[PDB]
């Protein structure tokens, strides 16, 4: 459960 890639 994670979003598209972070900064």
């Amino acid at each position, epitope marked *: *459960p994670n*979003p*598209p*890639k*972070p*900064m």
Partner: antibody
Amino acid sequence: QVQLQQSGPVLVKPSQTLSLTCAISGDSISSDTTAWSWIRRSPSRGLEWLGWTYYRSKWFNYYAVSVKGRVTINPDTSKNQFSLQLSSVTPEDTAVYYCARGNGNGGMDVWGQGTTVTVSS
Amino acid sequence: SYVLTQPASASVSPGQTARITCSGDALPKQYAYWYQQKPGQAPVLVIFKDSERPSGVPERFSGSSSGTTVTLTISGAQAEDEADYYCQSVDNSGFYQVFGGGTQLTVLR
């Protein structure tokens, strides 16, 4: 190529439900583009975010906190579309609705034609 | 809840640099994006990855990050730029994206 086609103008009665469709061309809804987003423009509210849907691995759907309890984004993998279904509409929901795609880590490039919805009896 | 704060208006003269700002409490992280709204039609992406210009955009359009406060600097402003500008990014955990109120560039000309 990557083209988004929205539905036509809508007149929805004030207590009823709104249904909108965004059809895609040139790419798969299930790819890891992972935006397939809906948005709206109101005269004085401005650009407000509505909802998301990601990919096949597990179709995540996350909506804005402002409208979470009425919205629902549903992909149609048969037709290569994603739909907007907004419940208990309000005369304040009258706006112009757009749909968009994101390449993933870096954009909301592609946009739709727009859909003008009128919430009136 | 989460919020991206942006001014409401901005004015400049042609051939003059304009500087729009958008402050956010999660912008230290999560990258950032800019869009333009000329009324009547869909938005247009002007900058992404906080400084990366997409294609098709004039070289006058550029932006820095500066941590919690991101900006859009438009040099040698041409009058065709008068529009409403918007800043977008996403919350921590990047699970809900957000918008700003929107500035209105005037380009008195």
